[PDB]
Every structure is written in structure tokens, then in C-alpha cells.
Amino acid sequence: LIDEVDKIGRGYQGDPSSALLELLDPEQNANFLDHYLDVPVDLSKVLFICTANVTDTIPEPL
Amino acid sequence: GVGKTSIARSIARALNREYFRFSVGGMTDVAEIKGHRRTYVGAMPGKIIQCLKKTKTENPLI
Ligand SMILES: Nc1ncnc2c1ncn2[C@@H]1O[C@H](COP(=O)(O)OP(=O)(O)O)[C@@H](O)[C@H]1O
């Protein structure tokens, strides 16, 4: 579960939305790897939910 | 939503070369393109370097 997705600052040295996009990619998610850990991990069987009070300030690509 | 990404993947499949995509749009910093100076605490090279790594190919599709 993810909350306040619309509230993401996405400011300096941030831009986590890309990761979120990379998190939410139907195909790339299956090979996700971290900065701490480089091995890829499946994410096709994990269910994701996002919550916001507005459908607009959320990134369009996301 | 016209098939451009799909046909890019199809092109890579037909040519046998690797397919990797990434979104540069709405990105200001150039570090991820060129990594960091390697002196900053906890630095990686550019995302192109990560592609060259995970691909294990010299002529992938970018
Ligand atoms: N000519 C086509 N043949 C097969 N599939 C198509 C065609 N045009 C569009 N599509 C489908 O529509 C979707 C559009 O998504 P995408 O291609 O990623 O957008 P864009 O074309 O803007 O990159 C694709 O997943 C693709 O399956």
C-alpha cells in the first residue's frame, strides 16, 4: 500500500517517480534490483495499491 | 499508446539485439546519464553503464 502518492515532492536529488514507474512497470518489476542489492527480484505476484485525494497532481506517466 | 514501444521490442527480437528503454523526459540532472564523480560518498556510474552491464552486449537497443 502506498499513500499520498499525489503528494510526492519529486524535488532535488529525488525523482523517485521513475523508480515508482520502474516499480509499476508490468515487465521490469519482475527483475527489480536494489542499489543495496543488485540481484533481480520478481514483483509480478505482489499486489499494489495507491491512495490519493486527487487524480491529477499524481504524475501522468505514473 | 500507438505501439512504438511494442515495435521497438519487436525490432530488438527480430535483430536478436537486447532491448532496453528509459524515460529521459522531465529529467534535469545529468548525473544519472553520466553517473557521479565516484568521489561522492556512495556513487554509481550512469544508467547507460547499468544497461551496458545488465545487457552483457556491446550493441544492444537503447
Ligand atoms: N500496430 C500494432 N500492432 C500491435 N499492437 C499495437 C499496434 N499499435 C498499438 N498496439 C498496442 O498498443 C499499445 C500501446 O503502448 P505503447 O506502444 O507502449 O505506446 P507508444 O506507442 O506511445 O510507445 C502496445 O502495448 C501495443 O500492444
| Resolution of the structure in the document, Å | 7.2
Q: Which of A43, A49, A28 is nearest to B47 (CA)?
A: A28
User: Is-contact A40 A29, C-beta < 8 A?
Assistant: no
User: Is-contact A35 B44, C-beta < 8 A?
Assistant: yes
User: Is-contact B28 B40, C-beta < 8 A?
Assistant: no
Neighbouring residues of B35: CB distance < 8 A, sequence distance ≥ 6: B43, B44, B45, B46, B49
Asked if A15 has any chain B CB less than 8 Å from its own CB, the reply is: yes
**What is the distance in angstroms between the Cα of B53 and the nearest Cα belonging to chain A?**
11
Method: cryo-EM
Best probe residue, ligand 1, of B4, B5, B6 (max atoms within 8 Å of C-beta): B6
Q: For the residues of A17-38, what is the DSSP string, one character each?
A: HHHHHHHH-TTGGGGB--SS--
